[PDB]
Write an enzyme that holds these catalytic residues in place. Structure first.
Site, PDB file in Angstrom:
ATOM      1  N   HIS A  45       0.786  -1.228   0.000  1.00 43.34           N
ATOM      2  CA  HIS A  45       0.000   0.000   0.000  1.00 43.34           C
ATOM      3  C   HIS A  45       0.829   1.295   0.000  1.00 43.34           C
ATOM      4  CE1 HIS A  45       0.269   0.199   4.557  1.00 43.34           C
ATOM      5  NE2 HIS A  45       0.291   1.486   4.263  1.00 43.34           N
ATOM      6  N   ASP A  93      -0.068  -7.453   2.010  1.00 45.17           N
ATOM      7  CA  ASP A  93       0.457  -6.094   2.015  1.00 45.17           C
ATOM      8  C   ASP A  93       1.973  -6.111   2.092  1.00 45.17           C
ATOM      9  OD1 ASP A  93       0.648  -3.395   2.052  1.00 45.17           O
ATOM     10  OD2 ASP A  93      -0.367  -3.083   3.985  1.00 45.17           O
ATOM     11  N   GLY A 186       2.945   6.924   8.557  1.00 44.85           N
ATOM     12  CA  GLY A 186       4.311   7.246   8.191  1.00 44.85           C
ATOM     13  C   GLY A 186       5.278   6.149   8.596  1.00 44.85           C
ATOM     14  N   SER A 188       4.346   2.962   8.218  1.00 46.50           N
ATOM     15  CA  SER A 188       3.997   1.907   7.268  1.00 46.50           C
ATOM     16  C   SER A 188       5.148   1.403   6.419  1.00 46.50           C
ATOM     17  CB  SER A 188       2.877   2.400   6.351  1.00 46.50           C
ATOM     18  OG  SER A 188       1.678   2.397   7.085  1.00 46.50           O
ATOM     19  N   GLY A 189       5.172   0.094   6.192  1.00 45.66           N
ATOM     20  CA  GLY A 189       6.218  -0.497   5.382  1.00 45.66           C
ATOM     21  C   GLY A 189       7.496  -0.766   6.148  1.00 45.66           C
TER      22      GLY A 189
END
Ligand SMILES: *[C@@](O)(c1nnc(C(C)(C)C)o1)[C@@H](NC(=O)Cn1c(-c2ccccc2)ncc(N)c1=O)C(C)C
Length: 240
Positions: A45, A93, A186, A188-189
């Site tokens: 995402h 994801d 922020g 995320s990942g």
């Protein structure tokens, strides 16, 4: 990261900042983990938009020269074939980014170690989430890398009604949920580093939090379980 503390300069060398060009400047949008000198692991995402991305390693303060940063462009993005845009609850994801150039490893830039396929952690396992994400719900990004102690919440408990229920799957990892600390926009990942056999390994890729807010009691931060994709990851790097 809500409820965190500033991480030391050389504590998490595998952490990277994923940035996109906005106007005539670059802006941090997500975190990621360096897994190969020219490969980065992040959330699907985070790279779902048609933007130009770049990766920064050896980064500590987003708005200040640390004298340790290396800036590399992204040359190829590989999202999981089963990833469904905007449908984070379905899982998958995760994405891999092939860098335009191989980075140089040193005390600030290192490869994160991945878990063995199928590894599941016991409830309350010691982990740390790191990132430059919001330090408060609806707040602002952190300037320096933050870290927060986030113990795991096993699938049985996390999938219960008082927690996430059916929203969470076995292909995910739950950590935190104390109402004080958590991941936030922020982050995320980015990685979830867990201590296993005296060594830290990346067991998760930060995915989502509650719609109600970042640090919500009994709504732990949800991560993609890395150990469920070891075969996929190896297959992608091996043929790209
Ligand atoms: C993740 O940090 C992240 N990814 N993009 C962003 C923005 C653009 C900076 C806000 O932040 C963030 N998790 C999510 O945003 C996941 N999320 C979504 C979602 C779905 C698709 C694309 C972006 C965001 N939707 C609803 C909820 N509840 C989400 O958490 C942090 C891990 C909190």
């Amino acid at each position: 990261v809500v409820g965190g503390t500033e991480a030391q300069r050389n504590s998490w060398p595998s952490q990277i900042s994923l940035q996109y060009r906005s106007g005539s400047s670059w802006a941090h949008t997500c975190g990621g983990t360096l897994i190969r000198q020219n490969w980065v692991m992040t959330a699907a995402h985070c790279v779902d938009r048609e933007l130009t991305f770049r990766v920064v390693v050896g980064e500590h303060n987003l708005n200040q020269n640390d004298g340790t940063e290396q800036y590399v462009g992204v040359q190829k993005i590989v999202v999981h074939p089963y990833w469904n845009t905007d449908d984070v609850a379905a899982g998958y994801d995760i994405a891999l980014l092939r860098l335009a150039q191989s980075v140089t490893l040193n005390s600030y830039v290192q490869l994160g170690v991945l878990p063995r396929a199928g590894t599941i952690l016991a409830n309350n396992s010691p982990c740390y989430i790191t990132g430059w994400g919001l330090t408060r719900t609806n707040g602002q990004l952190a300037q320096t890398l933050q870290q927060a102690y986030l113990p795991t919440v096993d699938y049985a408990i996390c999938s219960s009604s008082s927690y996430w229920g059916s929203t969470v799957k076995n292909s995910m990892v739950c950590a935190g949920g104390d109402g004080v600390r958590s991941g936030c926009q922020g982050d995320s990942g980015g990685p979830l580093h867990c201590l296993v056999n005296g060594q830290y390994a990346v067991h998760g890729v930060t995915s989502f939090v509650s719609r109600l807010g970042c640090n919500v009691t009994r709504k732990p931060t949800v991560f993609t379980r890395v150990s469920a994709y070891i075969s996929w990851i190896n297959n992608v790097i091996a043929s790209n």
